[PDB]
């Protein structure tokens, strides 16, 4: 029964426009709707009527095709829209009074969803101009749905893009609870993980929550205020006003950067009285090019002339509160009559989604045109393959369609039947006096963000990067995981020996290698040289040189005077073995102090093994001779004893072959030593000790022999001193790391005491 | 325009019955349906007409309420059903010619789903009588849906229940591919995991697959034929025929137990010609009580009398291929006329879902009655709160409704708007000759399965339990995981020392504990006793006794004759120390061989430490005396030497305090020994060795002293033998576990050789 605005045509596009207000709870079953909507309603019906006239008058597309329409009141309520959609469907069915080819979707998403659920069963393509819910992106559930508006998912995309632009990490996130805000925050946090942006706490409040509730929410948000300053509300306007109430009450303004979605977009009524409260906030609007087409088509519309629109007349009486008695719709509500002088241009503000409506209409027109060109390239009108027009092929054409819209830019439909995003970023800035207002600060389009950074803050004193992680020191400071968020670093330095393995992971490289200046990596420290002017090495060298000079002098003296009683007092043949042993022992000091080559690794051990063994073998033979007392015999004994230690050295070579060892006293210290282990040093020392104990046993028996001018007494004393020195320096050797120096001093002083205690009396006597 | 069977009433229940056949592809847009369905169609319209008359005539419920109906052709096709549903909805809307309160759902599930998608938007409760798809169980998607039939999920439940009853694990599973079979197999495998039933391989074929494809499927199934014998097909009849073609071709019958869902339920046409092919198969049907109500209401229906049903007349001409020229529906298709004598009782077979239709009708009637009683307990007719009847409250009543159905049992609606399952299990058994047919073998109801096991196989020679895991041996056989399925055990035995920790997991308990007979657990083996009649212990005891007798005799003899030259030859005072040492050493043997008590742990070590040390201390003093040669002095030396070893024992007690050790030579052997470690045995042995070496050194000097009638020579020889024995038995001690026995023999023989070599000559001389 309800009146339908019917424009005649050949291919007939239906539409649902929210002409009347939502009926209250009392008339949900009767379904008597409220007052006529001005901005959302009749503007749109006039829009499509004029648009269809223009398309009818445009030879550019659909040449011999006339497009009619039916406008049915949608009342912004699901029930009424469903009634009207039923009327559409039955008309189309009984047609098979004319079949509806497609339909322009209702405003609200919560209504468009149900209308889609109904239309999906009859292959009726629907195009929406206001449905922005992202649950309509599915094609499993809503196959026949087309949007010239981007979903709220793309609002979330724009917000995350601008946050990325301003380089923030630890931002707070609140959202209105319901269909809108909840899903919006889900999308936002979905697209946050792809950017590494952290979220403080996904707070969730109503628009009807108490002032106390709002204050509690503000306190909860401010709990992390020092760290988190940018609060993204996927918020309704009333939520914004609630938060502003809370901010004025708590007085915690300034740090709270209110980044809002399409809530307080341009709606200053949201923030009237609270201009100072939320200055510097960032919001988003849909791009709405003011279309002059409708301005010209609409401002010249008088009630009498505009006969085609049925309720328009009625609208007049409500628009101006005047009762046009002359007009058939002589409503008794208004007292005064309507003056002919009263025009419509006054207070004329067109809807904020006018571009979208026109875009949807052209979208369907171009869909039909594309399908016509695909299937009817013959007759300029309706071909054979179009007479039973089917929704499947029309939707197929509509998926793969594009054109320049009335707005100015192109309209593309992706896989999910969504137009690309087209947003304007705006800031609630303050003027000179208390006249704060909204100003455009750039645009967001299809992914590319063109913001005007210089416009906001007017300087480089913006809100600090809300982050839980200050940039770590490039030296050794490594990130940690506090377990709270994914961007809360405690830049604790790595170990002195560690390097920067990763940004979040630290490691220390292999032994010997030490990190660089900035711990970029690590490098191997040079090995020790062991030929130095160090006091201890030079002291050893001086001692060895003095010993060599003394040995050479005494050797020469004893070789020349080989018949004197003083020389005859001792073995005039076996002393050469002593001299050779002593000289080799002295040269051992020089052997150790050099570059520790493989050949040197051989020679050093060879010398330090042979020379002491040889010397003490001669000593033990001499002591045995003395014991016999109180010479082609003892030579063989001495040779065998020397060969014993030579065999020991050979066996040690066989067991553990020498190689140039990179000795590591620490990990930050690298020295170069041969592979002489504990066994490799003890074994020669063991044999030397055995010979020394033998000498001690065979000489202690003759501790008090003053023969040859007090010879044996001083020899015994010196040997006791030598034994004491050996037993004292063995632990000093093992309890230190200056191994080469210790061996040098030990052998040098051993030979020195021996030579200086057995030969100095002899030299003094002879000269 | 399409003719609607309209029964007048006050509360009007619509219905959709598949009156005509599905229109072919050529007339999907024209929507001209095919021939009139007999079994599925007009039976049901007559059913509901008579049922509504009866409910109208029953004062038991809805006293002053008359129920009308509209029957609209459903044509088994989605498009026609949607057209008719649109008509219903528009009638109901314009009513607000009379409002439809509810609707009886279309037959097919693929049609009921779409009709539900349409009706959900208008609060129109729908009850289905044939929709068995389990995607309709959801209430998120299909809120206003009621089923008097159970879903296919419950067919899967029944199959899994019977498999559980017959106790099978490793069963093959095949399913028709599509809406039916795929979802059915999903449900079956869902409910299999709750029972631990394994699946061979979820094979998936069409009903249109080639004979080659069917043969390939049969080969794939038979690939596991020895292990898996029961093949559950959630199968269409054509799939069954395909599998039977394959079975006849391959000739792999017998082992293949065809457990089928509602495919070849009673449809012998599926298995005609293949009676021998799939004997012994198990199938399921919906319980269909043959309702005599409809039999009486329907058999007395003549075309002329039955004016209320519009197409019934037409049905007549198609039912009998006679053209009733007299009747207004004088179809020209049939040549012959209709004889008045021609009745309808011939070949009368009612539909297999008659009970379900009547149950649905009564279900809606009882829903209305319950809601009436809930809201209108006043006027016997329509109260105030019912005039604008709403679907929400009607569905609320329908959810919480129950009654005794026409079938005989109750109808309950759970949370998901589903009636409980009611199935009859049937077997394709063989008669005497080649006359194999279906026979009922029990029922399944709401969860309780009442099968007739004795009916099937007629003996205990059923199909073997198709399992991958034979029952493991109760001893130590543990299950494994081959990685193929969750019930493929290889009953490998556990370790000899292991126990049955779990059915699938094995473990071995703590040390010492050994498993029981059946490895139920483990128990601690008793410790060693070490007081035995074993040959070696008894030999030690005999030796010790002989030694004690000899020692006592010689002690007495030497005490009496304490002045003889033979006795005077040795120390006539120090020999008492020797005798006491020897006797204590002998008693050590008895000390070791007993229960190893804590006090015994003390005493044994004390003795074995003191006695040898004391004896050898006296020996070393004697040897020192001899060395002085070649007495209140040596007594103190001996006492000090004894106290040395006593202090050694005390220090060993301090370091490692004795405790009763459960010694474990192996894990299956438990002995009881003190905590005498290597150190605790070597230290006394070390001291003993030191004294022995001292004795050797001091006696080897006097190896050839024939004084006192060849005394020292034999003593030296015996001491050499003793040293050899010690050096030989130390490794024998360390290279064995008979520690107590070894110590006993060592000490006993040491004392024996000592006594028998130092004293036997003396005794022989004196007597
Ligand atoms: N964009 C709207 C608005 C929208 C929204 C989207 C989804 C769910 C709820 C919901 O309600 C709110 C609340 C606050 C801000 C914007 C929205 C749409 O419905 O698509 C737009 C037609 C609606 C209009 O202009 O009134
Ligand atoms: N039980 C049915 C039957 C059914 C089924 C269920 C779901 C999807 C497909 C489908 O097709 C098959 C194929 C073989 C066996 C049974 C089914 C139902 O549609 O509910 C029953 C009304 C259908 C009838 O009697 O024809
Ligand atoms: C982070 O943002 C700042 C401006 O706030 C700017 O330096 C740049 O966009 C980002 N930083 C770097 C190092 O690129
Ligand atoms: C497994 O099934 C068999 C009959 O096939 C029967 O023993 C019983 O139901 C099950 N087994 C046991 C041990 O209960």
From Swiss-Prot, chains A, B:
Gene Ontology cellular component terms for the protein in this record: astrocyte projection; cytoplasm; dendrite; dendritic shaft; dendritic spine; glutamatergic synapse; neuronal cell body; plasma membrane
Cytoplasmic compartment segments: 561-570, 701-713
Record localization: Cell membrane
One GO BP: positive regulation of MAPK cascade
Predominant cellular place of this UniProt entry's protein: membrane
Topology of this chain in the membrane: Multi-pass membrane protein
Record note on what altering residue 711 to A does: Increased constitutive signaling activity
Disulfide bonds: 33-75, 198-487, 233-235, 322-338, 376-383, 468-488, 472-491, 494-506, 509-522, 601-674
Topology feature Extracellular, residues: 1-537, 594-601, 656-678, 737-739
One Gene Ontology MF term: protein tyrosine kinase activator activity
Positions annotated as glycosylated: 64, 167, 335, 339, 402, 675
Protein role: G-protein coupled receptor for glutamate. Ligand binding causes a conformation change that triggers signaling via guanine nucleotide-binding proteins (G proteins) and modulates the activity of down-stream effectors. Signaling activates a phosphatidylinositol-calcium second messenger system and generates a calcium-activated chloride current. Plays an important role in the regulation of synaptic plasticity and the modulation of the neural network activity.
Oligomeric and partner information: The PPXXF motif binds HOMER1, HOMER2 and HOMER3. Interacts with SIAH1, RYR1, RYR2, ITPR1, SHANK1, SHANK3 and TAMALIN. Interacts with NCDN. Isoform 2 interacts with NECAB2. Interacts with CAMK2A.
Similarity comment: family membership: Belongs to the G-protein coupled receptor 3 family.
Protein name from the UniProt record: Metabotropic glutamate receptor 5
Gene: GRM5
